[PDB]
DNA sequence: ATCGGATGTATATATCTGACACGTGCCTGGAGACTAGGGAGTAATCCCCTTGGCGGTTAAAACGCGGGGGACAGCGCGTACGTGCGTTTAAGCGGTGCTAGAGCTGTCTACGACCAATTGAGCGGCCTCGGCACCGGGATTCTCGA
DNA sequence: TCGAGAATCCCGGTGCCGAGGCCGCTCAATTGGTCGTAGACAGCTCTAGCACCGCTTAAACGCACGTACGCGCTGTCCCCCGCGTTTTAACCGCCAAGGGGATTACTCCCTAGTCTCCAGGCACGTGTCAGATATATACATCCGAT
């Protein structure tokens, strides 16, 4: 059936693609396959799957094919790229002027890799005020160079000057920022014109929404935007799932990745380098105060009675933590100083009262991630309220403050268990293994976020266990979204499960992915389906010692028994503070 | 020896500049945050097309320009080359805002 | 029958039809005599001619084939009659006429 | 301390001393006394305070949460400040 | 949906004045607002007269009167001249 | 021939305020002019609104809006209060 | 049928009939909702009450059983709100509030 | 049998009168030059009023100028008086 | 003889305390008609109307004084001077 | 601060006069009783733009800090100006006649309303390409110490 | 004062985008009927401006004259501008759904509108007290003199 439509597109529209100068047969036709590492390769050696996918892309562009790479971080995609380019100058002898573009964050280290590898051939970078620019602008206007490296800023700016010159190959990095259609990169390339070849990268490919595949892929070939509008029909319907997108798109869509097997490489560190010790994964529940519920119920009304722009405002603030507008506390406590009821108000707090102490008693270092970093504000002083050793960082902490603080908490002896973060902003790329423990107050709100929140710790070199620790309160929207993007947690592993056979490029993969898949959904509908911290005490053992001594933390809070758990009423501020929340 | 122009020479040279130039001279945001901040006080939570706000920034900036030039006259008529609040509140006092 | 527009029959550029229409909707009088709309429309046309000519000249001052509001502000504020007319109204993107108080000029 | 941010910049500080200065200049005051800045703010205030209300007023009867450039246009007109360029 | 204006007319008038000159949009807008303004004033005044002398209809005459009010000096002179003369020529047919 | 005014009404209102007080004619006249003035402003404004929101009719609502425009502070407050309340009581029948 | 006046039915002193009539002749909107005339008439009545009370008090200041325009000028100019309202209008036989600039008073 | 073109009732405006005015206006001591200036302004003001009230009677097509046309003219500039009707 | 200006003050009390038009009827009139000559000749004027004009004028002046008064005060001079007037009108925009 | 006065200004005692308030009569103008109608209500979709944090970039705000000159007050003269005081015209009055001109009224007639049928000017959208923004190199001029 | 310092401009060559010019297609303009009528108008009745004289006293005028406010120069000192320095936040490219505003569609409750008629109110008289106004006086506010 529709596989034959696929085939037609394959042969003919491929012919048109190569004019623009399965697929697997016809896409791989042009034969250059080299398992060597090239000559000038210096200062380290591949993990030679790197040779394999290397060679794969080699054939791509020898097949006259651009590419898109899904590879996991820590595999030195950097090198792979580099050595590739070196090869182009090198055995290909092409010496083509090649554009490389990265986020400003890492460009330092990328330069560093030119150092460790190919000072043998030039680079050109850009940053640092007009002067350096106009200088090296003369350099490229001089035309002499080997590599030209930059970030997106001066792409925007000098892009006219850049576009002046013709181009052979063109590299694009963190290419999932191409995620968005009108993110100016693409169209500014239309004006900027183009290089005969191109490449896109991603650490993690993105939402199964999949314009994700489109903007990228369409941008790889004209065939891909027109055909992938016919696949605007197809993928508009890409997901009666068992009647369409489950039983069938095994065939249809999992064979659309079988379509994309010539078009993609992905790899798995813990399959190859396989140094991940473990991560042990949990989510739990909490109560929310009568304010945070009963009033929040009345403040559901107040969501419609600001109290407005509900989701991020109402739902997430209140359903997270209190006095976001502070009349809560102040009206209640004018002294505004830390006190009892800060632990009481949102169950996450009193929880922290029930866990963080044991963390200390178990001495295990914690990194956490947040949104609207203001919540973490409470955290500081909440911690102060016991006076606990901690650090904090947010998206607003400055660059070298960041690098510094990294080193600081990274002190092997650092008295800080708690170094607390903003998810995407503070996180960026990092590996901090001086912390053995991870905790989460918030949704994924797309997975890759808290996937970073996973990949800070147990990325290569953290061999201690990993408790993945989530707070979703009973009868809350974080439940809702939780299983929304957590659907995506079965959705990512699903079409991206197709990515998970195509990674290795072999079908036996997808054959494990059969019940990986269907078993996953089994779990998903086990969700068709209130915690006393006793049980938690019994789940927190990374050894049985932890059990004993923490149960004796409960000797302590046992015999000295600690007030009500939640804020539960007061009642004058019910009506009055209700109407002041009724705005 | 350093190069410093006689006092006020700068000021004049600007006045040439500004009179010779069109655009709104007040930063967009602060003006806005102010505006919304004000509108809070009547009925909350009101979307504002950028255009409308632009208009307000017109009416304001122009309005000021007037108020200066007059208050300028006032101080002149006091034989003082620098304005002082009494001069303002005088000027508004004549336009009757007071 | 052969129709043609009154504005054509006035040899003028403003659609007296449209004008008249606006008049009636304007609730001005319950009735409208046919001379009014013509007479008015012409008036407008004259006005526009005035302001346009003056401004466009002011554009030629910088020899700018296109007219910008700055020009408008300038020409209008320059004339006595008009600036008298419009003194109660601001022009967008106005700027202000070159203006200096004598006392502040140096020796 | 930190978590309590209640200590913060008042606005109309958002109107910047250099800006105000610049406008006085385009209007042509050459030497400016300091205090004017202060007072200047106050004046501007009243202005908005009268206008915006009335502007809202029309959006008031509009029964539509948004205030377009109209209510500006009009309300100004109802001050005799009637403005051009926007329609 | 269309929103009508005078723009094209304005444009053609320029072609009858400085026919070689361009106009920015924004300028055009200003012109429009200007016109409908003036129109407002006029209609108001005429209406007023109709009320005072207590006639149920507006003719050119009232208009002229109002014109003599608003537009001083040469405006009145040349202007009213033009209105009248146009009325004449057209009303010939 | 009669020429109507509000005078007697004004007078009776005084009888509802300072019932023992006299009024000179001239004063009365002033009151009349005052009233019809205010009336002018109001009607104008309401009319304006009707035009802008493009309704063919004027109700109490528009009136109220205009009132909120003109009469500041206590005027708005007490006033609009009274208009509304009167509307209520009467409209009960 | 038994007729009676709406103003009576409003218990108010202004002949909503007359008011309404004026409204329609006023060419304001092509149509009139019955609430408007009432609401307005009341408004007027309130206003008059205000100004009257204030003035008549001012008459009692000289204890003059009859009110004179002088009183009117005085009361109106005294109040903040009203004098704000009427500042652009003169009262006949006005006079001016007792007013002195400090600087001119002797020691 | 009378049309008599009048001469300088502006000079007819007496110094003592203007004085009285400023007195009600509150001014204490007075410069000489003031008289001429003040007279002139008073004039032009009048001109702007009369021209229009006339304009009314013009279109009214009547020999006589009511208090009304005065009033309408004044308001018509933005100055209003009460008590005389309208 | 009373100290200078004492008279002036005592008057200002008087005038503020008194209603009537302070300008002689005739000269005002002869002026008025004299002016109206210049537009259309020969126009009957009800006394009333003229009275109105004398209102508008006298009041208008009173305003203009009091302001110009302020102006000179702000110049720290207790006697008005023409520059002060033309200043005041200049702000009301008549200029 | 008195010495004392001399005058500003409200009180005491009639009363006179004028508009102001009470009684009138009819009238047209407001109220009711009834039908009628699109103007608004009420709601349907559609969809463009609206509110939450982040990475990087610059230009401008913040601020420091001379000296220079402008407020700024002080003060010593003067001349125009406040004033009273006896001169001095004229407005104001009021009263007398004067009519032209306001003001009101029957009439009809051309003219506007209205509509129905007709349509091509104006509008919405779609290229594009010369005016224009910019520039930076270089050409001059304004400033302030000699 | 010339000088060179700093400023500004000038221009030739510099991408770029709204001004404009093009082209379908409607609805709003126009035609030609009609009818109701408002205003022209032409005729009239009587008020209110308007001229003129006698008369009155106020009020304006000239001035005679002190003096007190304006004006000009000096020394002060204080804070503003200029400029350099160093910070920080507008400012723009982004992530991340909800909604309100826009539009159009189909139903009555409201309105105008007609006619009837009964009174509420205005024009219009007429008694009658408010107070304006004139005499007769005393402490409250200036003004030398102590």
From TrEMBL, chains C, G:
Annotated gene: LOC494591
Domain of life, per lineage: Eukaryota
Residue intervals of the Histone H2A C-terminal domain: 80-107
Keywords: Acetylation, Chromosome, DNA-binding, Isopeptide bond, Nucleosome core, Nucleus, Phosphoprotein, Ubl conjugation
Interval of the full protein contained in this chain: 13 to 119 of 130
Residues of the Core Histone H2A/H2B/H3 domain: 1-77
Locations listed in the record: Chromosome; Nucleus
One of the GO BP terms on file: heterochromatin formation
Natural source organism: Xenopus laevis (African clawed frog)
Lineage per the UniProt record: Eukaryota, Metazoa, Chordata, Craniata, Vertebrata
GO cellular component: a single term: nucleosome
Protein known as: Histone H2A
Principal subcellular localisation of the protein: nucleus
Segments crossing the lipid bilayer: none
KW Nucleus (keyword) present: yes
Function: Core component of nucleosome. Nucleosomes wrap and compact DNA into chromatin, limiting DNA accessibility to the cellular machineries which require DNA as a template. Histones thereby play a central role in transcription regulation, DNA repair, DNA replication and chromosomal stability. DNA accessibility is regulated via a complex set of post-translational modifications of histones, also called histone code, and nucleosome remodeling.
Family indicated by similarity: Belongs to the histone H2A family.
A GO MF label: protein heterodimerization activity
Subunit structure: The nucleosome is a histone octamer containing two molecules each of H2A, H2B, H3 and H4 assembled in one H3-H4 heterotetramer and two H2A-H2B heterodimers. The octamer wraps approximately 147 bp of DNA.
